[PDB]
Amino acid sequence: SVEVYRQKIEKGGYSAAYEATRRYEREEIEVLSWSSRWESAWSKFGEAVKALGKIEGAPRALVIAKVQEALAYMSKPLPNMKLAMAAAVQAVRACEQLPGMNRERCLDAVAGALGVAKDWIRREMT
Amino acid sequence: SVEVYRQKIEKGGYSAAYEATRRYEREEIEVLSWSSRWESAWSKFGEAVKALGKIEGAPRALVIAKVQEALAYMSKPLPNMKLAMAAAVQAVRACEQLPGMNRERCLDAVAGALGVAKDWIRREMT
Amino acid sequence: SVEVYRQKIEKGGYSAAYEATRRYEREEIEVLSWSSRWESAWSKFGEAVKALGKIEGAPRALVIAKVQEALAYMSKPLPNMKLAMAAAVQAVRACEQLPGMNRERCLDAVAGALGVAKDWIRREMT
Amino acid sequence: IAETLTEKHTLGIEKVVATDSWRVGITSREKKLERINISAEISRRIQDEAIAYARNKGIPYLPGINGIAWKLLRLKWLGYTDQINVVMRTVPAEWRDFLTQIMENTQMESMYSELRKVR
Amino acid sequence: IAETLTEKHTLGIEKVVATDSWRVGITSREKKLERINISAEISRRIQDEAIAYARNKGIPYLPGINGIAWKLLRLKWLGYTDQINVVMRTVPAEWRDFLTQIMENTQMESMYSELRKVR
Amino acid sequence: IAETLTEKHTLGIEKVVATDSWRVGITSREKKLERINISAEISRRIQDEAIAYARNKGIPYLPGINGIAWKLLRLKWLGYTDQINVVMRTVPAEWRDFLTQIMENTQMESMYSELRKVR
């Protein structure tokens, strides 16, 4: 709808984004403490998605999403490696439908991104 | 419901939490005295629930809750070891129904977290 | 329309563009950080279009647009060489329609501007 | 500057007293608050039975058997049955018949009132 | 001066609190907000069955099995079936029939409600 | 003093934030803005079919296939047809029929809506 569009345009975001930029360059604004807690937790999720570079072809969003879902279970204070393998085998089965990808080459990329052995994902496939 | 949602939205929580974060960094807020009494008392409950890490499988909330309930009785000014053992055997029975866990392997994780002998929970099982 | 024309005239664009030039010459305006992020990312697209200079003849907008579209897929954080070749074979087939241009002279210019081998674009032609 | 759990607890409180989220947190529900009426109802009903039990058998009234008979009532609803077995060994002998009187024998009255409260 | 991702995240937040876009982001939609009502409806319709399943079979109520059965309802709606089969091996034995009860046996009530929520 | 392409980009922005030409650039058009309403329509129509196509053939729903089906719709409108043939080799096999379902089988509904948008 354009009614939700017009209510955000009239708030003046183009000018306010330009003006807050100038305050940063004039050293009047420091880095927020939410941003410091953000990049400490997120940086492990950013490099694993870039390790899915050698998967080629179609919309690769489901392979990318289910790897991020698999790391999230491993990174808890009480990591659940059973439910982490649940989302991982969906990423392998979503990967092998793309043209050019074998099942073993999808087991290469996902286990290389997650940083675990390839036999753990092979077990739950059956 | 949405009407219970709206009355907390219009109070401006995203803006006001940003201003409290800035005031802490500008040394205008000291640590409240309630938080010092909280972290002094809570910290024994936080390291003990992380010792249930090697319990694997299903929703593990019932193992986590009945272990946290068991430490509450031991940490009283007058500790009740009989009512503490009542909640511990519910944690052991809730642990062993998970796939992969044994009766004996749950007796390590519960008694290791509580810091007691394994025979104290074995006596009350019957 | 003139109604959209008149509303942007009355804001005084000729005067304020003159005034902002003077502030730059009187050292009161620095380079915006949006500009430094722009020239670092765009500069690969600027010199590649100048490498299409030896294509002669007709409206050459379709050759230029689909080559800039082809570089966009190669320059992603996860580069998709399959979809990049999809736009390039359209730029090649658009190129060969012009008078004076052959099919092999067009594979010279497009594969030279993208900086890849000529045999890659030959495969998806068929 | 700093972000640890002592200061996360503090800055979560400072935003509450700023925007007045506590008193609007109570007054905006107005539907959960009838549970305080029902909880005070079952509270009296267990207490009156404990004194009537104490004068029929001539035993002294044991304070705190109201709470023991209530915790056993709530775990009976959930199903934590081996927790019930250890508390029944913990209470004295003459009061064990009172605790099963709250769970089983007043299944009609008291166990319904918890079923309306959690609803 | 600087342009990195920690500063890109900050200057996005500083722009929002300047122009007050968060509260007008919610109060301008007002049609998407009814999804919270339909979400809280299925939330209770799963939870009440989990306790009725707990007392028909005499097993204790396992908290979080209402959370597991809500995830499997949504993946069934999308079609991530091999995701389901590994989760079904993870839960205990007496609760596997409850999870397929949330998916299959209440296909009328609960599966239509997710179909109306995403519309 | 200086005139390069970096500070040409800057001095174009500084006269925008001075005259306030961005907000009057949108609010003076007010006829082109209903293209957002039609673009929000065809996105919904493609997405609803992609889930229904996913449950008739038992396959998981593949996200981003609503994006690919919309790009191939607009290139069919212009006529970039050798662009289409390489993208059809790129997608998986069971989803090729859905892509030619958007271009061919719903030409009466969806291809008219793009035809009414560019007008």
E60 neighbourhood in chain D, CB within 8 Å: 78-81
Q: Residue for token digits 């212009």?
A: F78
Interface touch C124/F19, C-beta < 8 Å: no
**Angle ∠(E24,E28,E29) on CA atoms, nearest 5:** 125
Is residue D2 helix, strand or coil? coil
- Kindly list the residues from chain D whose CB atom is less than 8 angstroms away from the CB atom of residue E55: 79
Q: How was this structure determined?
A: cryo-EM
CB E106 within 8 A of CB E114: no
Whole-angstrom Cα distance, residue C37 to residue C47? 17
Both structure tokens of B36:
């010092």
- Residue E60 is encoded by which pair of tokens? 């204790």
Name residue C108's amino acid: D
> What is the distance between the alpha carbons of residues A59 and D107, in angstroms, rounded to a whole number?
59
C47 touches chain F (CB under 8 A): no
d(C-alpha A70, C-alpha A79), whole Å: 11
Q: How far is A27 from chain E (nearest CA, A)?
A: 9
Measured at the CA of D109, the angle between CA E43 and CA E56, to 5 degrees, comes to 45
Distance CA D100, CA D81 (A): 13
Resolution expressed in Å: 3.4
Quote the domain boundaries for residue B74.
1-126
Number of cross-chain residue pairs from B and D with Cβ atoms under 8 Å apart:
79
Q: How many CA atoms lie within 13 A of B39 on its CB side?
A: 12
CA distances from C19 to A19, C6, C8, F78, F104 (A): 19, 21, 17, 43, 55
Q: Enumerate the residues of chain F whose CB falls inside 8 A of the CB of residue E79.
A: 54-55, 58-61
**Domain count within chain C:** 1
Q: Which of E31, E32, E37, E33 is nearest to E113 (CA)?
A: E37
Question: Residue C16: in which H helix or E strand, if any?
Answer: helix C13-25
Rounded to an integer, what distance in angstroms lies between the CA atom of residue A120 and that of residue A85?
8
Q: How far apart are CA C58 and CA D15, in angstroms?
A: 66
Distance from CA of F7 to the nearest CA of A (A): 15
Rounded Cα distance between D89 and D96, Å, is 8
Sign of the C-alpha dihedral, residues C63, C68, C73, C79?
positive
> Is there a contact between B59 and E60 if contact means CB atoms under 8 Å apart?
no
Q: Which residues of D touch B21 (CB under 8 A)?
A: 11
Long-range contacts of B103-112 (CB under 8 A, 24+ apart): B106/B55, B106/B63, B109/B51, B109/B52, B109/B54, B109/B55, B109/B63, B110/B63, B110/B67, B112/B51
* Domain limits for position F80: 1-119
Give the chain C residue nearest E2 (alpha carbons): C33
| Closest alpha carbon within chain D to A32 | D1
In sequence order, the 6+-apart residues with CB closer than 8 A to the CB of F93 are A97, A99
Phi (first) and psi of residue F89, to 5 degrees: -80, -15
- What is the distance in angstroms between the Cα of D81 and the nearest Cα belonging to chain E? 7
Region of residue E79 (phi > 0: left; psi between -120 and 50: alpha; otherwise: beta): left
To the nearest whole angstrom, how far is the Cα of E86 from the nearest Cα of chain A? 5
Contact residues, chain E, for C35 at CB < 8 Å: none
Neighbour count for residue B23 (Cβ, 10 Å): 14
Contacts of A36 in chain D (CB under 8 A): 3
- What is the spatial distance between Cα E51 and Cα D77, in angstroms, rounded to a whole number? 9
> CB–CB of F86 and C36 under 8 A?
no
Instruction: Work out whether the CA dihedral C100, C105, C110, C112 comes out positive or negative.
Output: negative
Touching subunits of E (3+ CB pairs, under 8 Å) are A, B, C, D, F
Residue B66: Cβ-neighbour burial (10 angstroms; 0-12, 13-18, 19+)? buried
Count CB neighbours of E51 within 10 A. 16
Residue F15 in tokens: 């006269």
A3 to A16, E19, F33: CA distances (angstroms):
21, 18, 10
Query: In the 8-state DSSP scheme, what is residue F89?
Result: T
Interface test with B, best of E15, E17, E65, E71 (most B CBs within 10 A): E17
Number of structural domains in chain D:
1
A57 touching F, CB under 8 A? Answer: yes
Distance CA E21, CA B118 (A): 57
Q: Does D1 touch chain E (CB under 8 A)?
A: no
Q: Please give the structure tokens belonging to residue A27.
A: 């050293």
The string of DSSP codes covering D68-108 is: HHHHHHHHHHHT-HHHHHHHHHHS-STTHHHHHIIIIITTT
Are F33 and A2 contacting, i.e. CB atoms less than 8 angstroms apart?
Answer: yes
As a dihedral over the C-alpha atoms of residue D10, residue D12, residue D13, residue D19, rounded to 10 degrees, the angle is 140
d(CA E17, CA A23): 14
List CB contacts of B16: < 8 A, sequence separation 6 or more. Answer: D15, D18, D19
Alpha helices (H) along chain B: 3-9, 13-25, 33-49, 61-74, 81-96, 103-114, 118-123
Among chain C residues, CA nearest to F86: C86
Question: What is the rounded distance in angstroms from the CA atom of residue F82 to the CA atom of residue F25?
Answer: 37
B interface test, pick of E21, E22, E99 with most B CB neighbours within 10 Å: E22
Say how far apart CA D111 and CA D72 lie, in whole Å: 11
SS3 sequence of chain A: CCHHHHHHHCCCHHHHHHHHHHHHHCCCCCCCHHHHHHHHHHHHHHHHHHCCCCCCCCCCHHHHHHHHHHHHHHCCCCCCHHHHHHHHHHHHHHHCCCCCCCHHHHHHHHHHHHCCCHHHHHHHHC
Q: Please give the structure tokens belonging to residue F62.
A: 């593949």
Q: If you measure CA to CA, which chain A residue comes closest to E79?
A: A90
